[PDB]
Each structure stands twice: as structure tokens, then as C-alpha cells.
Amino acid sequence: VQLQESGPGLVKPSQSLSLTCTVTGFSITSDYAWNWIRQFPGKKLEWMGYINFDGGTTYNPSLRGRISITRDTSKNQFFLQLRSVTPEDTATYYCATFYGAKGTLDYWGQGTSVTVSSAKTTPPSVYPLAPVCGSVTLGCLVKGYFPEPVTLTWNSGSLSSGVHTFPAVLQSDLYTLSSSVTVTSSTWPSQSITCNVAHPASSTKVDKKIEPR
Amino acid sequence: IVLTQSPSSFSVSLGDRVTISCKASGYILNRLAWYQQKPGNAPRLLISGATSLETGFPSRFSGTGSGKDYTLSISSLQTEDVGTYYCQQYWSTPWTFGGGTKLEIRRADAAPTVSIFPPSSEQLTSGGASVVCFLNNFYPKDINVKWKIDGSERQNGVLNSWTDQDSKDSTYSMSSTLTLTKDEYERHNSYTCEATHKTSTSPIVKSFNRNE
């Protein structure tokens, strides 16, 4: 009924990728097949395989010899192992259910993003974007981080209307993105504007106060 | 079995009909699913068995087809239908998906609001310089940005990033960032980002001068 993927978000090439799906609300031995599906950066979907409620497995021949799907019935969990990964295994990995008498992928987890890369986890530098000029739009430039993603919160999230988050791009091996916020000319710089930049992979949060001149 | 969707992208006005085709390389006997995927979310089952509408979706959605040929139709497009739609066969293993069809809302034109930002003193101390231009709340998505440094166009070191279509007003926004070294940046005076968009007969310009 409810599925939740977990596991490392960054794996180096040539190593094994291991993920866990924790299932609640339904026993993985009672019915259904329990599947792994992945979505590549270009958004194509690939079914990888399943473990059935009786423990039998079936795998996509595209992954022949490289995949194992196993389970722990005591914890209502099932697992993916993908061996000898390369950067082409970078994808969002989903677990999902199948019922033989229907045939579709009915219930899905939220997905977990895995990056296969030799690049090192690096927290972002946060730089202010303020008008030189000599409504007002401000921003924060979030540069030099790896892997994805980051979240930018303006004034601890209070500031809701008029925030834009631009998707990150790679620049010399590291991600860069920016976020914009637009506020009434009456509130800045009279009231403080701060961006708060969270990078879960490095367990860091950094705040930058926007200053005028 | 290979599943082919045509096309890969659709732009449709609110209230209009959309038709998404899916063709299987073999006969799949109606063992055909459709999924809707919104950004940041898992695919959600929409149609099973070619024609059966899943609970949680309205009758505006309908699946038809037989043999190798299947269609998902939306009779009257609504803003919450924005996303990517995939077909999937479950006739034979390995189960296979079509490549997806991304659906966006065709709304009225909207002109970009442009803002330009010099490199921060903080970034300059590290030896780099990024000049940032935001182009906010425009439609359609097609837009051309040109950077000029002391009046001369620069194309190297420019990175452009568009947001997804905004779920509220159906516009796009984008950042255009020009990255230079500190010494390259500090050798020139004027920095201009110029946007060409169908909402204006002339370029939409924002500039700053280091000598203020």
C-alpha cells in the first residue's frame, strides 16, 4: 500500500548500487510482485525486475548478470543490488507493486535519486544577487556543489509569493543554480531578506543576507 | 516489445482536446497501461487494460485502442493535467514503456520581466565572476538571450536554465548566467543582457556599468 525507497544517493563507478524499499500497510508475502523501475535523466523509464510474493524473481534481460532482488520478510522490506555500476546507471529508482490478475504498476514509492559518479560530495558556495542599479528582485547564486539537489528558502519560507528556483546545470564538474525572489520595494532593504540554502548530501545549511548599495 | 509515442510534446490551450498515441511493435491484447507523471513525483496509474479509467482521475480522460494501436485522450485540458504521460505494455516481459509525451498549457503571450545582477564582491574574491540575468514570467517558452560586454556579443560561458511551466500562471522563467574570470570581468565596463521575445518588437534590455 505504501512504499518508500532508501539508500545512498551517490555511488562510484565500478561499485555496487544497493537500495531498500520499506513497505507498510500490506505484507510482501501476502500478494503482488514487488518491482524496481528506474527513470533516467532524459526521463525514459525502464522496468528492472521483481520479487514475487513467494520469493521468486524475474529480471529484465538488459540487466543480465548484474541485478539481484532480495527481501527480508521479517522487516517487510525488499532490496535492489545492481553490480558494477557506470554513470549510465544514474537514475531515479522507484519501487512499485504489480497484481497478476490486473497487470499494472498500481502503487509506487516516491523514488530515490542515485548519481553514479567519481566526483566528491561538495557543499555549495552561496553568493548574493543584489541590484547594482547605480518591486525589487533579489537572488542567491548557489555554486560549486555536488551531487544534486539543494533547496533555497527565502526568509525561512515565510516569503512565499514570487520565488523562482532555476534548475541546476553542471559547470566544470560541479552544479550551479540560482533562486530569485521578488518583494515590494517598500520591504527591501527596509526589512532583511535572507536566503537559506540546504544541501542534504553534505548535511549543510548556509544563510546569506542580501545587502544593498 | 517496443512502445512508441507520438509526439514527445504537446502545447494545448485550456479546454481543448489532447490526443496521445502509443504504438506497440507487437499485438499486446489490450495489456496497455497509461501513467501520468508530474515533476518531482512518481508516475501515477491512469488507465489499465487499455480502456479502464483508474479511481482518482475524472472522465475527461479516456483510453482507447486494440491490437498495436492505443490512444489516451483528454477531452478538455485543465491546468492540473500538466505533466508527462507514458504508456506501458504488460503483455510480455520485459515490461516496456513508451518514451513519454510532455503536455503543457498554451496560454496567452506574456512578456518577460528582466533583471541583471553583477558578480558579488564575495565571488570576485575567489577569482570568478558570474553575471546573472533573470527573465521572469514569460510565454511562450521560446526566448533568445544575448550578452554584450562593452558592446560586443559573448557566447562562451553562458548557461541558460528554464523553470518548468508555472503551475499557477502557466508562464516560464529562466536564468542566463555569464561566467568570466575576475580579470576578464574587471577589464570591461558595460554588461548587457538582451532578450528577444515575441511580446516585443525590440529587444528587452537590462544593463549595468561598472563605472556607475
XYZ file of C-alpha atoms in Angstrom:
425
model
C 0.000 0.000 0.000
C 2.758 2.462 0.974
C 6.312 2.112 -0.356
C 9.437 4.086 0.489
C 12.818 3.775 -1.219
C 16.051 4.493 0.617
C 19.773 4.144 0.104
C 22.873 6.050 -0.968
C 22.364 8.944 -3.377
C 25.946 8.839 -4.704
C 27.818 5.689 -5.790
C 31.182 5.460 -7.531
C 31.575 3.701 -10.893
C 32.548 0.008 -10.651
C 30.868 -0.383 -7.230
C 27.512 -1.956 -6.396
C 24.354 0.112 -6.016
C 22.113 -1.057 -3.165
C 18.634 0.252 -2.397
C 15.902 -0.680 0.057
C 12.131 -0.462 -0.304
C 10.267 -0.400 3.014
C 6.624 -1.441 2.625
C 3.821 -0.559 5.036
C 0.114 -1.361 5.055
C 0.474 -4.680 3.228
C 2.623 -7.772 3.653
C 5.048 -8.537 0.834
C 4.340 -12.255 1.314
C 0.570 -11.940 1.011
C 0.194 -10.930 -2.643
C 1.674 -8.894 -5.501
C 5.017 -8.731 -7.212
C 7.426 -6.141 -5.860
C 9.255 -4.282 -8.617
C 12.147 -1.930 -9.222
C 11.765 0.632 -12.020
C 14.193 3.396 -12.896
C 13.882 6.719 -14.706
C 16.933 8.115 -16.477
C 17.857 11.821 -16.588
C 16.305 12.068 -20.057
C 13.082 10.736 -18.449
C 12.821 7.311 -20.115
C 11.538 4.547 -17.830
C 12.984 1.028 -17.515
C 11.444 -1.881 -15.629
C 14.284 -3.704 -13.869
C 12.687 -6.769 -12.275
C 10.564 -8.006 -9.414
C 10.476 -10.358 -6.472
C 7.134 -12.118 -6.228
C 5.186 -12.631 -3.009
C 6.514 -16.219 -2.956
C 10.163 -15.128 -3.299
C 10.610 -15.954 -6.982
C 12.365 -13.369 -9.116
C 12.290 -12.181 -12.729
C 14.736 -9.659 -14.228
C 14.966 -7.568 -17.370
C 17.483 -9.267 -19.706
C 19.038 -5.802 -20.207
C 20.496 -6.231 -16.686
C 21.509 -9.904 -17.091
C 24.053 -10.995 -14.521
C 24.124 -7.542 -12.916
C 20.927 -7.393 -10.821
C 19.743 -9.181 -7.688
C 16.413 -8.528 -5.970
C 16.057 -9.960 -2.465
C 13.788 -9.455 0.524
C 13.589 -9.537 4.324
C 10.112 -10.754 5.250
C 10.775 -10.084 8.954
C 11.015 -6.346 8.187
C 8.631 -6.195 5.182
C 11.495 -4.866 3.057
C 12.835 -5.743 -0.381
C 16.147 -4.796 -1.895
C 17.900 -3.962 -5.138
C 21.530 -4.740 -5.866
C 22.958 -3.536 -9.172
C 26.570 -4.512 -9.715
C 29.476 -2.782 -11.457
C 27.572 0.449 -11.989
C 28.611 3.045 -14.564
C 27.442 6.648 -14.972
C 24.689 5.318 -17.260
C 23.036 3.882 -14.136
C 22.369 7.407 -12.846
C 18.598 7.483 -12.439
C 15.696 7.878 -10.061
C 14.861 4.429 -8.697
C 11.270 3.532 -7.801
C 9.690 0.542 -6.149
C 6.180 -0.420 -7.222
C 3.582 -3.193 -6.985
C 2.003 -5.474 -9.589
C -1.066 -7.715 -9.165
C -1.150 -10.698 -11.529
C -4.899 -10.519 -12.130
C -4.723 -6.833 -13.164
C -1.201 -6.430 -14.542
C -0.343 -2.755 -13.996
C 2.064 -0.983 -11.646
C -0.520 0.157 -9.117
C 1.319 1.599 -6.103
C 4.655 3.413 -6.291
C 7.206 4.796 -3.893
C 8.367 8.399 -4.033
C 11.633 7.461 -5.757
C 15.247 7.936 -4.752
C 17.784 9.686 -6.969
C 21.106 7.892 -7.403
C 24.058 9.565 -9.089
C 26.850 7.308 -10.307
C 29.952 9.485 -10.402
C 33.522 9.700 -9.117
C 33.025 13.362 -8.173
C 33.243 14.175 -4.475
C 30.413 15.454 -2.310
C 30.979 19.211 -2.071
C 28.763 21.795 -0.318
C 27.740 24.936 -2.214
C 29.118 28.426 -2.043
C 26.280 30.937 -1.693
C 26.662 34.354 -3.277
C 24.216 37.271 -3.110
C 22.423 38.665 -6.162
C 21.539 42.287 -5.464
C 20.956 45.144 -7.914
C 23.918 47.378 -8.623
C 21.288 49.799 -10.044
C 23.816 52.634 -9.704
C 9.052 45.754 -6.795
C 12.675 44.644 -6.483
C 14.077 41.261 -7.492
C 16.875 39.681 -5.459
C 18.518 36.324 -5.707
C 21.062 33.855 -4.469
C 23.637 32.101 -6.623
C 24.406 28.598 -5.358
C 27.593 27.363 -6.943
C 30.115 24.561 -6.749
C 28.125 21.738 -5.171
C 27.772 18.010 -5.750
C 25.642 15.923 -6.026
C 22.168 17.349 -6.536
C 19.995 18.750 -5.035
C 19.713 21.899 -2.981
C 16.707 23.771 -1.660
C 16.592 27.540 -1.277
C 14.224 29.007 1.297
C 13.674 32.775 1.473
C 13.142 34.351 4.912
C 12.781 30.868 6.430
C 9.988 30.124 3.964
C 7.735 32.945 5.147
C 8.313 34.722 1.820
C 6.084 32.619 -0.440
C 4.877 34.669 -3.411
C 7.284 35.429 -6.225
C 10.052 32.857 -5.704
C 11.650 31.111 -8.682
C 14.054 28.181 -8.440
C 16.099 27.556 -11.528
C 17.227 24.007 -12.341
C 20.894 23.354 -11.755
C 23.463 22.885 -14.515
C 26.930 21.368 -14.419
C 29.808 23.824 -14.646
C 33.345 22.390 -14.550
C 32.275 19.184 -12.697
C 30.021 20.951 -10.157
C 26.412 22.116 -10.061
C 25.326 25.745 -10.108
C 21.816 27.111 -9.690
C 20.133 30.299 -8.620
C 16.903 31.326 -6.977
C 15.057 34.611 -7.336
C 12.619 36.382 -5.036
C 10.573 39.491 -5.802
C 9.354 41.731 -2.982
C 7.817 45.166 -2.703
C 10.352 47.970 -2.990
C 8.937 49.058 0.396
C 10.183 45.927 2.210
C 13.795 45.854 0.954
C 16.229 46.996 2.129
C 13.996 48.266 4.976
C 13.311 44.666 6.071
C 16.003 41.999 5.909
C 15.997 39.434 3.085
C 17.884 36.205 3.641
C 18.218 33.076 1.538
C 18.797 29.764 3.310
C 20.460 27.079 1.170
C 20.218 23.434 2.237
C 22.319 20.686 0.656
C 21.234 17.372 2.213
C 24.085 15.367 0.660
C 26.659 17.369 2.649
C 24.336 17.920 5.645
C 24.854 21.678 5.361
C 22.653 24.752 5.507
C 24.079 28.205 4.755
C 22.276 31.543 5.068
C 23.176 34.696 3.147
C 21.793 38.135 3.997
C 21.070 40.310 0.954
C 22.678 43.762 1.305
C 22.132 46.849 -0.883
C 24.387 49.660 -2.077
C 8.075 -5.223 -27.416
C 8.936 -1.603 -28.240
C 6.414 1.110 -27.421
C 6.472 4.338 -29.452
C 4.654 7.531 -28.505
C 3.938 10.377 -30.907
C 4.627 13.112 -30.380
C 7.030 13.756 -27.490
C 5.489 17.120 -26.590
C 2.150 18.917 -26.827
C 1.079 22.503 -26.201
C -2.697 22.798 -25.847
C -4.983 25.639 -24.768
C -7.088 25.207 -21.648
C -10.358 23.484 -22.515
C -9.085 21.940 -25.748
C -8.741 18.254 -26.565
C -5.453 16.376 -26.430
C -4.713 13.054 -28.125
C -1.651 10.956 -27.204
C -0.856 7.982 -29.445
C 1.034 4.857 -28.407
C 2.035 2.102 -30.845
C 3.329 -1.324 -29.822
C 5.704 -3.320 -32.016
C 3.581 -6.425 -31.466
C 0.000 -7.276 -30.652
C -0.478 -6.749 -26.911
C -4.168 -7.686 -26.483
C -5.137 -4.545 -24.525
C -2.465 -5.182 -21.846
C -1.690 -1.486 -22.020
C -1.383 0.992 -19.158
C -1.137 4.775 -19.132
C 0.614 6.730 -16.383
C 0.619 10.440 -15.581
C 3.815 11.887 -14.100
C 4.077 15.350 -12.597
C 7.530 16.840 -11.880
C 9.002 15.638 -8.605
C 6.516 12.764 -8.353
C 6.373 9.106 -9.295
C 4.264 8.037 -12.284
C 0.625 7.527 -11.303
C -1.519 4.834 -12.918
C -4.240 6.441 -15.048
C -5.586 3.714 -17.369
C -5.397 -0.067 -17.079
C -6.342 -2.634 -19.696
C -6.323 -0.017 -22.490
C -9.747 1.364 -21.546
C -10.303 1.204 -17.765
C -10.064 4.580 -16.015
C -8.417 4.446 -12.592
C -10.065 5.824 -9.473
C -8.830 9.337 -8.799
C -8.976 10.529 -12.396
C -12.002 12.203 -13.990
C -13.934 11.143 -17.082
C -12.141 13.840 -19.094
C -9.509 11.109 -19.537
C -10.275 8.154 -21.782
C -8.179 5.286 -23.109
C -8.978 3.516 -26.362
C -7.303 1.032 -28.631
C -6.713 -2.537 -29.726
C -4.026 -4.667 -31.296
C -0.929 -2.481 -31.620
C -2.632 0.945 -31.565
C -3.677 2.794 -28.402
C -4.696 6.359 -27.546
C -5.078 8.438 -24.396
C -7.471 11.358 -24.850
C -8.199 14.336 -22.622
C -11.445 15.925 -23.730
C -10.921 19.333 -22.077
C -7.437 20.189 -20.838
C -7.077 21.624 -17.334
C -4.068 23.142 -15.596
C -3.619 20.162 -13.263
C -3.162 17.889 -16.305
C 0.300 19.350 -16.997
C 2.854 16.554 -16.881
C 4.291 13.694 -18.895
C 2.200 10.708 -19.950
C 3.651 7.247 -20.553
C 2.175 4.100 -21.984
C 3.383 0.693 -20.861
C 2.756 -2.808 -22.155
C 2.375 -5.740 -19.761
C 1.698 -8.425 -22.355
C 5.187 -9.902 -22.143
C 8.301 -9.465 -20.039
C 10.293 -7.391 -20.008
C 7.607 -4.809 -19.464
C 8.370 -1.745 -21.551
C 7.337 1.899 -21.557
C 6.837 4.405 -24.297
C 9.145 7.386 -24.314
C 6.625 9.796 -22.837
C 4.608 12.753 -24.073
C 5.025 16.020 -22.188
C 1.915 18.211 -22.071
C 1.999 21.956 -21.431
C -0.658 24.674 -21.413
C -0.844 27.091 -24.352
C -1.785 30.372 -22.630
C -1.790 33.940 -23.934
C 1.510 35.700 -24.520
C 3.353 37.202 -21.542
C 6.378 39.465 -21.645
C 9.468 38.673 -19.548
C 10.484 40.895 -16.651
C 14.278 41.140 -16.905
C 16.714 41.805 -14.040
C 20.519 41.902 -14.201
C 22.976 41.366 -11.338
C 26.724 41.996 -11.225
C 29.083 39.486 -9.645
C 29.131 39.868 -5.896
C 32.267 41.153 -4.223
C 32.271 37.796 -2.426
C 32.541 35.818 -5.652
C 35.204 38.168 -7.024
C 37.479 37.408 -4.052
C 37.537 33.739 -5.108
C 38.673 34.770 -8.605
C 35.452 34.094 -10.529
C 32.689 36.333 -11.819
C 29.138 35.328 -12.747
C 26.843 37.956 -14.246
C 23.242 36.838 -13.831
C 20.137 37.805 -15.790
C 16.683 36.644 -14.678
C 13.839 36.646 -17.214
C 10.642 36.043 -15.285
C 7.044 35.084 -16.115
C 7.005 34.908 -19.913
C 5.125 32.899 -22.517
C 5.789 31.250 -24.938
C 8.923 29.468 -23.779
C 10.941 30.395 -26.874
C 13.238 33.280 -26.000
C 16.713 34.336 -27.090
C 19.196 35.982 -24.741
C 22.305 37.752 -25.975
C 25.076 39.003 -23.721
C 27.128 42.063 -24.669
C 30.323 43.107 -22.889
C 31.423 46.636 -23.825
C 29.006 46.348 -26.741
C 30.404 43.075 -28.128
C 28.423 39.834 -28.063
C 29.800 36.973 -25.952
C 28.563 33.387 -26.297
C 31.173 31.315 -24.455
C 30.489 30.780 -20.774
C 26.733 31.412 -20.974
C 24.426 28.914 -19.268
C 20.641 29.155 -19.615
C 18.145 27.345 -17.366
C 14.344 27.390 -17.711
C 11.894 26.515 -14.975
C 9.072 24.095 -15.594
C 5.811 25.719 -16.622
C 4.457 27.520 -13.557
C 1.507 25.667 -12.060
C -0.294 28.937 -11.212
C 0.046 31.274 -14.211
C 1.435 28.815 -16.814
C 4.409 31.063 -17.606
C 8.087 30.195 -17.712
C 11.076 31.859 -16.149
C 14.728 31.450 -16.957
C 18.164 32.424 -15.762
C 21.003 33.306 -18.119
C 24.403 33.378 -16.437
C 27.661 34.609 -17.983
C 30.732 33.306 -16.149
C 34.134 35.003 -16.567
C 37.328 35.293 -14.596
C 37.721 38.266 -12.284
C 40.352 39.807 -14.567
C 38.158 39.344 -17.659
C 35.246 40.921 -15.808
C 37.245 43.841 -14.414
C 38.692 44.793 -17.823
C 35.306 45.873 -19.256
C 32.734 48.481 -18.239
C 29.264 47.652 -19.558
C 27.387 44.359 -19.224
C 24.078 43.893 -21.021
C 21.608 41.043 -21.322
C 19.208 41.438 -24.254
C 16.082 39.291 -24.570
C 14.287 38.736 -27.883
C 10.723 37.528 -27.358
C 7.621 37.737 -29.500
C 5.998 40.149 -27.000
C 8.315 42.981 -28.093
C 9.359 44.258 -31.499
C 12.671 45.405 -29.978
C 14.990 43.527 -27.614
C 14.200 43.750 -23.911
C 17.461 45.064 -22.446
C 18.959 45.357 -18.978
C 22.464 46.649 -18.374
C 24.870 47.913 -15.780
C 28.071 49.931 -15.943
C 30.912 49.203 -13.546
C 31.906 52.891 -13.528
C 28.321 53.872 -12.499
